[PDB]
Symmetry: C3
Subunit: 308 residues, 3 copies
């Protein structure tokens, strides 16, 4: 079999993504019913930059599949410094059945996947956050049923990993995705083109706008994220002024559908991209969304392992 990897949301076809999301719902109901890693077999969970929350969901999820996660955090020498990335991948492939990697540039993930003989999963990268969006789609389906035809709007920095993955993963599910962002902070053109092509196959659409009011109107799902990642704190820009009109606050939420829900990948900077009232309010699904990282990532691993 071809080894399957999951480095970006569109690595799954629409039918494959539906299979993974249905498995996520099954695993939420019966969390120890799938044991492909019984043994235990190993899975590498490697952090070029620590993310303690990604650590909880993957370490526990792997264990609930019967496996043993070997967790490497940024205390270790960064992968590729002491030894070529290719050499490390060949050794890892002798010890583990899958490699979960949080890293920076997408080309590093691509390189690992080209040489490893086990599935490689992007746990979080500069360009994409596909496991978060699987958990988001699971959360939306829990609350609203069929995903096809829903309207989702994302607000804030339109070129970050969540904007890119909501575009790609959302249209793969048949969701009409809107990115509301200031000029200068718009989605990468190759990601946007990929999302537009995928939307053709599912009946979805891609919209990019600077009009936050228009993006909120009629939306079923509103999403935001922090405006600035750690790498961007020294980029020289004022990263508050451009985004203030895109804050997810009660006024924005009241423009959406009466049954709209609110998502946010965490961590949240309350008072910047989202207000306490919205985050702690009845439309917020952020805590269920965080829980579903555990279930959606287990489903993905089960699915990749059985295909590889």
């Amino acid at each position: 079999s071809v080894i399957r990897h999951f480095l970006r949301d569109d690595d799954l076809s629409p039918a494959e993504q539906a299979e993974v999301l249905e498995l996520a719902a099954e695993l939420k109901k019966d969390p120890v019913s799938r044991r492909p890693l019984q043994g235990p077999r190993g899975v590498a969970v490697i952090f070029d930059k620590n993310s303690t929350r990604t650590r909880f969901s993957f370490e526990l999820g792997i264990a609930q599949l019967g496996g043993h996660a070997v967790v490497v955090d940024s205390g270790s020498t960064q992968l590729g410094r002491d030894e070529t990335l290719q050499d490390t991948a060949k050794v890892l492939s002798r010890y583990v059945d899958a490699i979960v990697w949080r890293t920076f540039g997408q080309e590093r993930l691509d390189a690992m996947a080209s040489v490893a003989t086990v599935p490689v999963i992007n746990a979080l990268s500069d360009e994409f956050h596909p496991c978060q969006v699987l958990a988001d789609l699971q959360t939306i389906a829990e609350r609203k049923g069929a995903l096809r035809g829903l309207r989702l709007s994302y607000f804030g920095d339109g070129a970050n990993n969540m904007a890119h993955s909501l575009l790609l993963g959302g249209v793969t599910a048949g969701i009409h995705v809107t990115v509301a962002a200031p000029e200068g902070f718009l989605p990468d053109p190759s990601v946007r083109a990929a999302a537009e092509r995928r939307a053709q196959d599912t009946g979805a659409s891609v919209t990019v706008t600077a009009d936050a009011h228009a993006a909120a109107a009629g939306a079923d799902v509103l999403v935001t994220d922090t405006w600035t990642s750690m790498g961007q704190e020294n980029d020289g820009l004022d990263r508050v002024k451009p985004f203030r009109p895109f804050q997810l606050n009660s006024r924005l939420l009241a423009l959406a559908d009466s049954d709209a829900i609110v998502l946010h990948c965490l961590p949240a900077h309350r008072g910047d991209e989202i207000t306490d009232a919205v985050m702690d309010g009845p439309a917020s699904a952020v805590w269920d969304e965080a829980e579903n990282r555990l279930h959606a990532q287990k489903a993905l691993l089960v699915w990749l392992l059985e295909r590889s």
Copy 2:
């Protein structure tokens, strides 16, 4: 309805007796209780590393069938990247209990007010309640009933072990004496809570600078590292002091020991020392506490 264990008096006398009985049962049959089978997760978070505390909690959770997710001090501090309240809400979706080594008590209180799973103080600035459960297990297995015994702690009477031996000790019915120099005495709120609890159990609280009188007739003698050190040398737990205790007295020390400061080679390697059994019982007593908290939450 969620029970937490942040200080020794969080357990009533009757509840503490239940936990210590369970600790004895688990020492005999260490994999007979599997409330975390699955595995279910337990968070084990250190704001400052304590390797001894990691071993005992991590293995204990595994022997309950669970998986400990261990976060060492290297990682960004809990509460730096998001509110402790938001962290507690997310942790409560991934794990069945939160074991936390932090500094100030108000951080523990903040986590426990929000988390919907039990929170356990692994070790803090003000209290070390899990160590005192292990100490009480050790005393019981060597002397039987705890009620009425005399325990004396020597040295820094302001630290977490002095506070927890006062509260946990009087909760078990033990007459507790802290022997300490004048600048290093128990916190007055802790001392008062121990005096009140002592009225329920028949116990008592004494604080003195007279190490000789603290040692005379003691059944259990305890010390701890002293951290500038001249004030503690008269409270050194040495052979002279131990010679004053009741026959078959036992010496405890939470470790690590600095041999030649707070305790001598002769006392620590001698026949009264129960320091190695004490260390082993961190594993059993902490497992018992988790089983008990999980059942009531």
Copy 3:
């Protein structure tokens, strides 16, 4: 009697063969042995981190049914805050074995003098005995019986791999040659221990600066990095002395036509070994890396049974 594994000759020739046979059995059936079911604990302690060593031990212990408790250098170094003997006595109450990566051999000896459970040297300044068990497992599966094979090691002849290939090699009956420049030769105590063990096994010890001669007719060619991190500030040019000992295609061509090449990794390609050799048909480095898992599990099973 508690059995420890601090240096390669801690096993007799017969005992080493038992461990290597077990390593082959565990490679075939990796979860058939569960001496640590429970789980029981095993301490895995790193005075200096080695992520690649952690993976093999942590997974191997789990596949024996146990739980590895890992301590790395972010914690207070063992010995600083209490005696090593006190720490050994407490660890012995929590775990069934102690795996330790540390520096001088006296530290390992101190731990093992008091521990009531097996102590295993995961990697130290003087020896790397678990790696050589994995090397011997690899040689055996590529060449068959070990007795009488000719193995040559190239590079820094005073490092942990040279010492362990000497001791573990002659324990298996292998004729071991160390090819190294003057000033970088095996420790005399280690060389003498290997010479004495070789008399029991029919093996031999050779130390030479003639890299050509060491490669000629060799069945196994081995190298390692020329510098450990603790040596970077030692004041020596640690490149020019070792260039003649590079494991390159010209050197490999001198060996037996069926020769294999070993390297404990990570490799610095272009220094001690070239891409052509690393990636060519004689290289066994990836199987070697895998066999760390199996050989270490076999060692643990064997020590636990005897302790």
